[PDB]
Q: What sequence folds into this?
């Protein structure tokens, strides 16, 4: 529940007027992969469904 | 005097693992011909079983900043943290790369680490990052430092995986500390050095030390 | 003071003062503390 | 379900625009490759099905 | 840190044939700061 609320904020930061803001999109993706736990128990890599 | 890693130097990528409370040191190795994938050669038992170091040596060909790498991709330096390095396999003359395939079943987000025939593309470039707060970006990389290698193309760490029963190296999102132990920096003309392949001649270039030919009765021993 | 880098060694055993390399899954607990141990090899950043 | 739907929505909006991919920009291609690795195509079809 | 930033800025315009107006203005202010740092370092050691 808490994670979804932060996800939609990043949705508005990277997508403006129907186009993707590449400056923000690249930063968010790199930040997300540096902390893989942001993807939930799934998409965890090892031991993750 | 503090040793600094420079280009054209031969190094070995060495990591550490825990096996039955024992610290086991492993070197990244690859055959090149017939098998592109990289494996781990143990070296802690070199007293009793010599490791196969002929396929563990890599040459630091280039070391560039991220912007310089981007510019050169569109078209003896000292190693600095945050730079991108190009590792060439000493034996097969191939380049260490983050392969797009994945033979592991435990990690779905991991990629195989292997050798690439050419240095083209960004899949064969790795960025060095400090493992601890002791070193910062832009500082010189010193011998014995723990490094964090990140693939430029895949944004994944050079990871040692212990999920299976064996020890395997792959490109995952979990970091792993590596040591770039130097092998040789600069060799004078002539002046035999360790790790070379040579012949031992007896007299005036007439007889040389050798074993029996193939399919011989003495089992070539 | 503040310039010399010192490695602490136990005289009787020869062990070096270093950290314990904290096990993962403990970072979520907020434990930035690293347990100090005496080890035969240690690490390169053991200087104090 | 809402978390992963929000997560997939965020990653989808982080994808580069078509004109960047057609231009062959290296950064755009790298980002799309990372996104494809995170979310396999078969899982997308399975959820829709 | 300033030198590394200037080096990165050069690589950004290395491919481009001509540096545009905004890039030149940012280069000018970076050089002005670099002049002061060099002058400050010079004042530290002179005397000598």
A:
């Amino acid at each position: 529940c808490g994670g979804e609320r932060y996800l939609d904020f990043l949705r508005f930061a990277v997508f403006v007027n129907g186009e993707s803001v590449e400056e923000n999109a690249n930063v968010v993706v790199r930040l997300l992969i540096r902390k893989p736990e942001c993807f939930g128990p799934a998409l965890r890599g090892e031991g993750g469904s | 005097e503090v040793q600094f890693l420079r280009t054209d130097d031969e190094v070995v990528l060495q990591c550490s693992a825990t096996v039955l409370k024992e610290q086991l040191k492993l070197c990244l190795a690859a055959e090149g011909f017939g098998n592109r994938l990289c494996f781990l050669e143990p070296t802690s038992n070199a007293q009793n079983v010599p490791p196969d170091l002929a396929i563990c040596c890599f040459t630091l060909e280039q070391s560039l900043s991220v912007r310089a790498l981007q510019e050169m991709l569109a078209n003896h330096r000292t190693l600095l943290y945050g730079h991108a390095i190009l590792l060439r396999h000493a034996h097969s003359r191939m380049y260490l790369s983050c392969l797009t395939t994945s033979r592991s079943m435990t990690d779905k987000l991991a990629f195989d680490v292997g050798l690439q025939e050419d240095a083209t593309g960004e899949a064969c470039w790795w960025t060095m990052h400090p493992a601890s707060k002791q070193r910062s970006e832009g500082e010189k990389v010193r011998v014995g430092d723990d490094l964090i290698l990140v693939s430029v193309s895949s944004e994944r760490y050079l990871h040692l995986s212990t999920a299976s029963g064996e020890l395997q190296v792959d490109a995952s999102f979990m970091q792993t500390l590596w040591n770039m132990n130097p092998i040789c920096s600069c060799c004078e003309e002539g002046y035999v050095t360790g790790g070379h392949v040579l012949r031992l001649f007896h007299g005036h270039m007439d007889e040389c030390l050798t074993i029996s030919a193939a399919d011989s009765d003495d089992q070539r021993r | 003071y503040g310039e010399s880098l010192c490695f602490v060694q136990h005289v009787a055993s020869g062990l070096w003062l270093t950290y314990a390399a904290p096990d993962p899954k403990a970072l979520r607990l907020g434990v930035l503390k690293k347990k100090a141990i005496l080890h035969q090899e240690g690490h390169m950043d053991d200087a104090l | 379900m809402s978390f992963y739907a929000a997560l997939i929505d965020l990653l989808g909006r982080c994808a580069p625009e078509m004109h960047l991919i057609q231009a062959g920009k290296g950064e755009a291609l790298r980002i799309r490759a990372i996104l494809r690795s995170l979310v396999p195509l078969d899982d997308l079809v399975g959820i829709i099905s | 840190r300033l030198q590394e930033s200037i080096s990165d800025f050069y690589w950004y315009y290395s491919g481009k044939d001509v540096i545009e107006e905004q890039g030149k203005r940012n280069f000018s202010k970076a050089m002005s700061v670099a002049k002061q740092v060099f002058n400050s370092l010079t004042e530290y050691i002179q005397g000598p």
User: Anything to note?
Assistant: Chain E has two helices and no strands. Chains E and A do not touch (no CB pair under 8 Å).
